């Protein structure tokens, strides 16, 4: 079931990139798998550079952890930063040098939808604290697809919007009081946005929460370890109920507990 985050486990390393192209990146599974994929299917994008187009796909967890990809997709336009997600058969990613979110259907390699996130800063305006052009961060939780960003009107505070996964329309929007560039990353669990304090520390914390159901903001002190000292991506998977992260070449996962 659902609840408030109360604990994060130790990071477990599932795969380590062998080249500088994977110093930062995004890896993910689909919380709503659709044919021909399953809950084991894994995608990995090494995101260093300026023409990021290769998406590595692995049918099996064993292949993700020990082998070569089973398929490589070449995106039709370059991707920006580490914020992408996979949801219900599509990769949702941000176009390079844009505030455009793109829905790319993985089995057909068809762009099904594109949407400018209204007012969103991009390309170094409202990144997380490490930089990396992390202005726009997609998220999946128990209720579906969201996007995390900021705007000039919000003065750089985290804004989050629920997204229609079919056509990318914004369905509802909330404004927090958390400066986006003051936190290392963020993710959503059960409709509550959580932030991480530091991308370098072994003794970081999950330090803020904003509950979209109640409008209430809280401070937290839940320990969070950046084992390799440079976490570029931290997302939540609601099917596995785990955090997925990318830390200085390493694809890692953290158990959690909800109350
Ligand atoms: Ca995130
Ligand atoms: Na994301």
Numbering used by the authors: 244 to 502
The study reports:
Inherited missense mutations in the myocilin (MYOC) gene, within its olfactomedin (OLF) domain, constitute the strongest genetic link to primary open-angle glaucoma via a toxic gain of function, and thus MYOC is an attractive precision-medicine target. However, not all mutations in MYOC cause glaucoma, and common variants are expected to be neutral polymorphisms.
At the outset of our study, five variants could be confidently predicted as benign polymorphisms: T293K, T353I, K398R, A445V and K500R. These mutations are all found on the protein surface and well documented in the literature. Assessment of spent media from cells expressing each of the 16 full-length myocilin variants revealed WT-like secretion for T256M, R296H, L303I, S313F, V329M, S331L, T353I, A445V, V449I and K500R. Indeed, in our cellular assay, some misfolding characteristics were initially detected for T353I and S313F but, ultimately, other characteristics including thermal stabilities were found to be within the bounds of benign variants. Structural integrity was further confirmed by high-resolution crystal structures, which were solved for 11 OLF variants.
